[PDB]
Every structure is written in C-alpha cells, then in structure tokens.
Design a protein around this nucleic acid. Structure first.
Lengths: 73, 75, 74
DNA sequence: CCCCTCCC
C-alpha cells in the first residue's frame, strides 16, 4: 500500500547544504530519482543559518528520501 | 574541447562586492550556475579596500564568469 | 600608486610555443620574472594534451607586466 | 546586497 502523498519539511544548517546537493547538483538529483520523492531545498532565509528542505511523496518515499539525505551528510 | 581547469584571481574594491554577491548571495549563485565556473570571493582582508575573487574552470567558463561579473557591477 | 594583494593567474599555451617563452638556457623566462617582478612557472604538458599551464603570481601590475612580456616573447 | 559542492 502506497497511501497518500504527504509533505514533510526539515531544516539543515546552511553550511551542510552542499553535501546534500553535490557538485553540479548530482547528489540531490540522485536522491530524487532513487527515493521517488520530490525534494525541494529553499534558499537560506533572511540572514539565517537554516535552510528548509521540503520532501513530498508517499510515506515510504519520504522515509527513503530521509535516509538518502542522511547518507549524503 | 573544454581544455584544462585553471584558476584566475582578480580583485574588486570592497565597496563593490555587494553588487556581485547580491541579497542572500543570489547574484553570485547565478554567476556560478551560468558560467559553470567556481567563484570564490574572499573576506575583506585585514586593513585594506581590496577583495580577492578566485575563478576556477575552463578558459571559456572563466571568460563567461568575467563577463557576468562585469555585468553585475556595470548594471 | 597602490600595489594591492599578490594574486595568482593561470593561462595555457600551446606546447609547441613554450620554447619562445623560455629561451635557450631558460634565459627569456628568467628575464621575464626579473623584469616584471612576477613569479612565473610553466608546467610540464598534461597527458594527452597540447596545452601547458603558466602560473603567474604577483600584484596586478606585475601580472599585467608579465602578460605583456610573455606576449612579446611569442 | 555577504554567498560558498547550489540542484529544481
């Protein structure tokens, strides 16, 4: 059972965002295709050190994506 | 034919660095993406009004980057 | 009227052209470094390639001086 | 205008 598409957000220290994205964005593109989740990384907010990541998919896809995001860091 | 990855440095007056970087760094992000060069702007340094920019890529990337840098300041 | 930071610039040259920069017994390049005051290093050609990288280190003036002298060599 | 493996 897939269940519904849901959206989850988390923040990431901006210092660490390059690890999830990777040179030429390869690593995030890989995370999106492997997990099947939509993954958005916002620009860092106004004078702040947090960057919001939005993950959208079934619960499994989102749990898949959270692991792949962890393994990146 | 891309050729070797090389590094060039130039300086800018520190009072011009804002035009290049942009609010929340958006302009410089755009310049890196578009030229495909790595572009690093150093902090202040200590005492002086010059700020070093390091550009790394193929010769075309670096030339592409130098135009986009100039386009940021001029306009 | 103000020298500024020592900075580094690289440019490539066709390998077939490097003899002109160097001179017999490395004398033209020696002359280029003393003249401009820039430090100038020419790498060995990278594998499978026609290009040699030249690294010039100095202030902006020294580097521009060196870039002219390199050009006048060719 | 202050970013920084920078993707969409």
């Amino acid at each position: 059972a897939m269940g519904p598409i849901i959206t989850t957000q988390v923040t990431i220290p901006k210092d660490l965002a390059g690890s999830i994205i990777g040179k030429g964005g390869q690593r995030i593109k890989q995370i999106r295709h492997e997990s099947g989740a939509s993954i958005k990384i916002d620009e860092p907010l106004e004078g702040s050190e947090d960057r919001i990541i939005t993950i959208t998919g079934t619960q499994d896809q989102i749990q898949n994506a959270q692991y792949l995001l962890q393994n990146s860091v």
